[PDB]
Ligand SMILES: *[C@@H]1O[C@H](CO)[C@@H](O[C@@H]2O[C@H](CO)[C@@H](O)[C@H](O)[C@H]2NC(C)=O)[C@H](O)[C@H]1NC(C)=O
Ligand SMILES: [Ca+2]
């Protein structure tokens with residue numbers, strides 16, 4: 001009866017990026033950011049970093065419900081991301097911009113996060129292409145971890161050691177919910193980092209993670 | 215008070231609206247108003263009525279313009295004295311003032327209650343106790359004062375405070391805060407005509423960000 | 432219901448008590464809903480904004496199909512789309528205001544008494560009324576009665592391609608004195624006339640920080 005994705009909104013003539021209401025599988029309305037420009041348009045954005053205004057070093061409950069601002073930076077929420085990716089096949093695009101306004105990206109053929117009981121386990125399909133290189137396949141089939149809920153494969157606490165929240169193993173090659181450290185940083189791997197892109201010592205200006213039906 | 219829809223940004227937060235942004239609320243029996251909800255700061259659930267962030271909007275405005283509200287949802291605004299009255303008539307809304315300097319240091323001030331009276335009574339400020347805040351208390355001084363704009367001098371100065379300090383506020387013998395002042399960008403030689411909070415950065419420092427917001431105490 | 436009870440312009444919305452600038456739904460003449468940016472704050476308010484530059488986040492060097500449907504973001508920069516702009520201006524008389532801000536915080540503007548863009552078959556031909564006033568000076572009258580041109584569809588009066596030479600999309604002639612869909616070059620630039628330029632304002636080597644083009648029924 002109503003649009004189920006950003007792709008449906010684009011097909012109905014909504015050509016400007018912006019926040020729109022879609023209807024989840026259980027018919028629950030959810031207001032989401034549609035990217036109607038990048039790579040054909042019709043992407044639903046679930047993470048956005050742009051200026052460091054929002055604290056991403058948050059706990060399990062906050063990541064679960066979503067946080068931030070429609071005017072800037074946000075994480076849409078693990079329950080919503082699960083609901084968006086649970087049924088069907090959604091492709092993942094990651095877009096990264098450095099402080100000299102160079103763009104890189106990574107695209108994966110499928111992406112989903114499982115539900116809370118499986119700790120928002122990441123299920124990721126094949127790397128398809130991207131100038132940022134592949135720094136997410138390494139995290140496939142890992143639980144999500146936050147500072148207060150360590151589900152990683154390190155004897156210590158990765159979320160604390162890298163000041164983020166992610167599908168940490170031992171520990172990471174990407175850390176996009178890390179600190180907004182602004183370009184090159186001496187501190188090791190605690191910024192908005194993508195190892196195969198700018199490496200463990202460069203924190204991007206912009207990060208966006210988004211999905212679209214395959 | 216509306217039983218059929220959300221009455222405040224706090225109700226919206228309690229119903230699972232977790233992102234900050236512009237939402238519709240229902241004022242006391244029963245007018246809809248679209249407001250900016252801050253769902254992050256200090257528990258979330260604040261309704262924002264004033265916002266300065268980049269100097270794009272002129273705040274040196276007249277009585278009619280302050281009455282109806284002005285600026286933009288995309289940046290800087292004043293929600294409007296009639297809306298602010300309607301929002302705080304009653305009945306124990308707390309006030310939080312958030313200030314950010316040009317080196318990205320955050321300060322704030324919180325008050326236990328806040329309301330502005332109606333246009334008759336000149337949007338008189340009724341302010342409760344200072345509770346806490348790193349910015350210090352630079353608003354208690356303005357308690358029980360009429361609002362003044364350049365074309366409507368209701369202050370206790372022989373001259374016109376709004377003109378002398380290039381703003382609009384609950385001016386008395388003029389002021390110790392001036393958050394609707396000029397966007398002067400950090401330290402300024404001109405006296406007390408910027409976005410100033412005396413007990414915070416003083417009469418010669420204009421903040422980068424200012425937000426005034428309310429929440430049921 | 433919605434079409435007939437609903438606002439047709441930003442001016443209607445202002446008349447109904449919406450005093451903050453922001454994105455609202457209006458209903459076009461053919462009853463199609465369109466979400467537009469209303470400016471309620473500048474010069475009496477009630478303006479429908481159809482172009483906005485503010486930070487360089489959106490690429491404006493785009494093709495004919497993209498300009499036709501509109502592009503960018505409600506959070507920042509956009510072009511509303513040539514079909515929408517035609518639909519907004521087709522019936523009656525809309526005045527045009529152009530607002531420009533430089534990197535030193537100087538505000539300039541230009542106002543024109545009418546502004547209309549024809550439909551796709553007429554290549555979104557500009558029909559512009561008299562210059563009324565403005566501190567930016569008049570750098571649009573020169574473009575009157577020109578087709579719109581994009582890099583892949585040259586309809587200008589130059590032997591070459593103005594949209595490519597000037598890295599934009601506009602009602603180019605041979606070629607321009609304004610280029611507000613040009614590159615976001617940030618203040619002074621050595622490259623010639625390929626920025627967000629208004630000749631009579633800051634000239635052919637200065638790209639403004641902010642650009643807004645907007646219309647209101649007059
Ligand atoms: C718009 O421009 C067209 C050219 O594109 C003008 O058409 C010419 O008008 C003159 C007299 O004004 C005629 O003698 C020519 O034969 C016309 N040329 C063509 C190709 O049709 C047109 O009149 C201009 N319109 C306005 C309103 O100034
Ligand atoms: Ca561990």
Ligand SMILES: [Ca+2]
Nearest residue numbers: 367371372373
């Ligand atoms: Ca006086």
Ligand SMILES: [Ca+2]
Nearest residue numbers: 585589590591
């Ligand atoms: Ca040509």
